[PDB]
């Protein structure tokens, strides 16, 4: 059936959008991660997905089914791995699985793929994850196959934005798990997936210049998160979504012309 | 509230699991071909479907699914030649299931099942399985048990196949893309589903034996192994009335409240 | 001569791949428990059997076989707890196929025929046949064939499946150490069977779902999954024909001369 | 020595002998580091820390890890470049691995990795993640250990604008720059040749990464940042405050 | 009545090993060209041979040998760039040995003799039992011993040597294919030797360094190392009851009731 | 410098640029040398062979490998001694694996390596093996490895008598003796105490090895024979013989 999702395609109706020469596929890289008492746990999963949707729509573009397991959650970062709930794999098996996606995606024929993360410490395994599979082209005798990788967020760095969104000034992305920017998504896109009510308050997460193991739980906010949302709004989340989504748009258009 | 853990908070399901007697289920799927009238992602979406309504019927949650599985055999699955079909090496799959294992039992669950939705995934689930558990004794924990299992074999009785194939069954290895599946798609997800794009062509017969470098020539062109040409919903909430009833009773027999 | 590669000098082996069109094999047994009445190389006893007279039929070689094979299933097998059987991981059964590949593609073979005897080998195989030829693409050679069988997918004549269960037959899986492989090594390894020791107990019936770890009390104490005590010399002499004829005429319609 | 690698076997079994033993490994990189400063910078600098560090507290230094991970564009230029040898993900995290195994086998409890080369991170993390976990089916869960990038230790922002007058930009963009061809021109002035210094802007990428590796996005001559203004006075600066607040940072986390 | 574990049913073995003190013996070995006299698996014959004999001597079992070992080096076995010779990556035969003495542990067993066959062998096989050992460690297990050996290393006695290479001895580097194991084939394997094909050409000589890729020219093109135009039956008598029982006594030192 | 990790980018790629550079790689290990000597000894030889080789014949060296494979009992004293910090087969194949695919990448076809850790031989060449076979894959097919233990250049009965005058008995009973104690005299004279050496009988072992490994099997300095008759003077005899023997055997496999 004709949609944006590959998942939703019979191969006649995937094989026909690549015969085109030129189909960009798009790849959700998420996680299962605790998020506070105010949101689900898989909010990784659902926000770049959501993302993908929407720029796959106004550029024209094919998502493929999202990771819904990513790397190991970090203190500094993401809380801690040591939350129930949170499921992460080892580096080696995320690299693997994009290693495996992207041997499988030039076999069809496809030389386009842009990842879209939605989980911070996903990044460098994702990363190398392409560069073995590029090697591997190479060796099957291809070169022209083209990766654009990106975290969602990134694109959100206009200042008006971000005084809008944070009226009160932006400690960077070192602290926002579960804070004010994905539960603002999350109002505007799934709210029946956040209780604002739960939120915990309590001032942002400070961490010294350096990583402890084993981690320990003390070093961590008890709720999970490292900053509260209690100013998230489904307002905030309409317009941090266009922002991404016309960015993200507008940059792929330039990295894979018609 | 749902039986999806991806749906809950953290609080909320680590007071699931301290119950003590909690039930984790896992959908592994696949991304693959399914003929001219149906979706790639069927083998996701029906264990996924399964496992709903088992975990919803004895109280369980449902673990986000592996979209992606084992390579595509040609006598089962048609073969790993066909475009849209997206499949892992099986070191790749195994330490996905392992990985998942370890995680929960870090997390103090020790009930998990697991659904299989993909026909070569079995064996690959499995070594996950057994490595999980080798460290999981490595780590001071043998009381962690998994049930395993692909839902289409609680499909046995004859009366139940009688109806579905009024003409006479050829075994799991002949339905791919067929009467079967399309049948639950139509109960379960019928705008995935164009029964006018069906080609009705004859089984597929293979030999007893796998050749390597698959042989395109040996797969009918649709990419299906027989007909779906009398799938239909009645059949579909037939299977599933099935699947959901066994499972769950297997289910209540391995892990008691 | 032989028709064993290990039996022959390079010189010999090379003459043979020289001819352009030879035809190797290789057996994928297992070191797993077989009851009271059998001997535990049995997985590899009858494969390599079976190559050496197809082998001989058709003018082909067989290489060293595979003694340790993958982990033994509980339905399939009787379970991976028993004391003798040695199993390896299943990374290790595909890489040690993956490499022979290798090998051979490096003599100038382009022809194997993989011969299983253990039920559980089969997926491990088919990974390590994959590996083996997308390296070998990356090499320049696409002209690699391969085979895979278990050599008793060949005994599906109704015809004979009668003579040697007139009862009724349930199915491979339930058929471990039972009348036909004893039957088997009744006509090839007589030494290695004392019928005097076989369980005469009733056919393991089984739920449609596996349990891990494994548990002991689901699988017959003797290890076997069925009887074997009508097993006999001539049911393992018809049973050998049927296969070896079977097997060299698959051979001789894949790799024509 | 403070050495592990100048050490006879005894002299490093007795200080163990302790118990209190803190160990402290450098993993760096070969890499391209413009056309003015040799391609070990990655190596010597967290040695040169370590070193000092050492000295302060009684600590002992392991051989550095010569080789790291692959050059990532946006933070190092990017892995096309001639001389850059790196290793796979798997290969780092392995030997990271190897060694904490081999350390708790000692009898050491008390490791801290100082990494100074931007990609290793993550690859290290696995690799202490990995060890634990092993550590932990051995029986052992009294190892700790304390990852980190020295340049994190440089946040005052008095200390910032004395190294960057007109502004700083994140340790992005810094590869060649300031911050390590100081620390260079500080402890191995001979293997620095400022005159050969390419000036330019700082580098500006798009949110987001391309592959393969597109050369003409990274500055020709490697460096992501110009290290014109960089100087012995802002190395002896940077190398202090690194020290004093990692020696610190030890104390707390390994305290005797 | 036999020392081979894979010709015991598993009650037998079993009984052996809950016995206590079992000590278990495996041939490692190689398919490996060796000559225009020889056959190419004699390095797993001879080790093989030679357990059998050690066992039945003291009472130990043999394990079915590693058919195929780690790639031939040319300043030992000529190269592996020789048809027939059939090598495994140093990763897969260090798995097979771990995964082995994995299996052997959960048996009970807690002794084992790897006999090794095949000069390249050796440091994959340490490894195998190296991270084989520290597995055991996390399953609590530290009681499992292991002795690695070459057969031949038993062969040191001056006497001995004298009346094997009257003319000389010069290490087991130049010696593949030669006087030590064509003379042990002729007293144990006579069929699969024939004298009349041995190329009497002088020992191999190498500078002190190794080139990759391997250049052909620098191996006697017979593929030998040295003439085994000198070897007898009677020269392998000598050295097979040499090893044979020195490796038996050796056992007997180790591995005490 | 022949050092490659003290040229910038540019030098390295010039040097390389001549279309027949000939590297080299020093793979040593961490392991504990006796009463008398430091741990790093694998690295320091072949690391210094290499670097008068190299300014012989104008070659360049890559940073060397500072952690090896397991020491072996019967030829290293045993992997239990404190200090000896060793990786596991797998992880060191993949090292040599992943630097010989990215000196391939940089137009490098040339490689020596230089092993000054007994037991490493094999997974070295297992690494090579692995490496040109992908390289293979990636249509490179002139790339040339020479892969050395340095001690193995001193055969000239000559030599070993004016060594050994009481007589020699073989490399694997070398570990911690005249040998390398010698060549330290000569190189790292600070790094050497001959006065703590333990003058004890050579070791004798079996024709096999037992696993775990038997502390009581080797001599307790760790030391597998007496290094009382080391000298600078033997040191410099063995230096020149081995520069010399591998500067000539370079030549002859990779002409000009
Ligand atoms: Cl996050
Ligand atoms: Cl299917
Ligand atoms: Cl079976
Ligand atoms: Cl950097
Ligand atoms: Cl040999
Ligand atoms: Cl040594
Ligand atoms: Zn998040
Ligand atoms: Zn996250
Ligand atoms: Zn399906
Ligand atoms: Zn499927
Ligand atoms: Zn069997
Ligand atoms: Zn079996
Ligand atoms: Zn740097
Ligand atoms: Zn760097
Ligand atoms: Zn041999
Ligand atoms: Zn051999
Ligand atoms: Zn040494
Ligand atoms: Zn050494």
Same mark, same amino acid.
């Given at each position: 059936?004709?949609?944006?999702?590959?998942?939703?395609?019979?191969?006649?109706? $995937?094989?026909?959008?690549?015969?085109?020469?030129?189909?960009?596929?798009?790849?959700?890289?998420?996680?299962?991660?605790?998020?506070?008492?105010?949101?689900?746990?898989?909010?990784?999963?659902?926000?770049?997905?959501?993302?993908?949707?929407?720029?796959?729509?106004? %550029?024209?573009?094919?998502?493929?089914?999202?990771?819904?397991?990513?790397?190991?959650?970090?203190?500094?970062?993401?809380?801690?791995?040591?939350?129930?709930?949170?499921?992460?794999?080892?580096?080696?098996?995320?690299?693997?699985?994009?290693?495996?996606?992207?041997?499988?995606?030039?076999?069809?024929?496809?030389?386009?793929?842009?990842?879209?993360?939605?989980? $911070?410490?996903?990044?460098?395994?994702?990363?190398?994850?392409?560069?073995?599979?590029?090697?591997?082209?190479?060796?099957?005798?291809?070169?022209?196959?083209?990766?654009?990788?990106?975290?969602?967020?990134?694109?959100?760095?206009?200042?008006?934005? %971000?005084?809008?969104?944070?009226?009160?000034?932006?400690?960077?992305?070192?602290?926002?798990?579960?804070?004010?920017?994905?539960?603002?998504?999350?109002?505007?896109? $799934?709210?029946?997936?956040?209780?604002?009510?739960?939120?915990?308050?309590?001032?942002?997460?400070?961490?010294?210049?350096?990583?402890?193991?084993?981690?320990?739980?003390?070093?961590?906010?008890?709720?999970?998160?490292?900053?509260?949302?209690?100013?998230?709004?489904?307002?905030?989340?309409?317009? %941090?979504?266009?922002?991404?989504?016309?960015?993200?748009?507008?940059?792929?258009?330039?990295?894979?012309?018609?």
């Amino acid at each position: 059936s004709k949609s944006v999702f590959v998942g939703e395609l019979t191969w006649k109706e $995937y094989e026909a959008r690549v015969a085109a020469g030129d189909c960009v596929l798009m790849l959700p890289v998420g996680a299962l991660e605790q998020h506070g008492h105010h949101m689900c746990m898989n909010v990784d999963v659902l926000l770049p997905t959501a993302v993908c949707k929407r720029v796959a729509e106004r %550029i024209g573009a094919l998502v493929m089914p999202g990771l819904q397991y990513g790397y190991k959650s970090q203190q500094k970062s993401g809380g801690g791995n040591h939350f129930p709930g949170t499921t992460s794999l080892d580096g080696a098996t995320l690299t693997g699985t994009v290693q495996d996606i992207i041997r499988e995606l030039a076999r069809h024929g496809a030389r386009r793929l842009v990842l879209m993360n939605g989980h $911070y410490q996903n990044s460098m395994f994702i990363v190398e994850g392409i560069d073995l599979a590029l090697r591997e082209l190479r060796y099957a005798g291809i070169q022209d196959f083209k990766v654009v990788v990106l975290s969602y967020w990134d694109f959100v760095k206009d200042p008006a934005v %971000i005084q809008q969104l944070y009226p009160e000034g932006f400690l960077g992305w070192d602290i926002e798990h579960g804070g004010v920017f994905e539960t603002s998504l999350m109002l505007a896109l $799934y709210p029946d997936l956040v209780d604002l009510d739960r939120v915990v308050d309590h001032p942002p997460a400070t961490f010294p210049p350096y990583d402890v193991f084993p981690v320990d739980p003390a070093r961590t906010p008890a709720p999970g998160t490292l900053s509260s949302a209690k100013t998230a709004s489904r307002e905030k989340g309409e317009l %941090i979504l266009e922002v991404c989504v016309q960015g993200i748009a507008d940059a792929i258009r330039e990295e894979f012309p018609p």
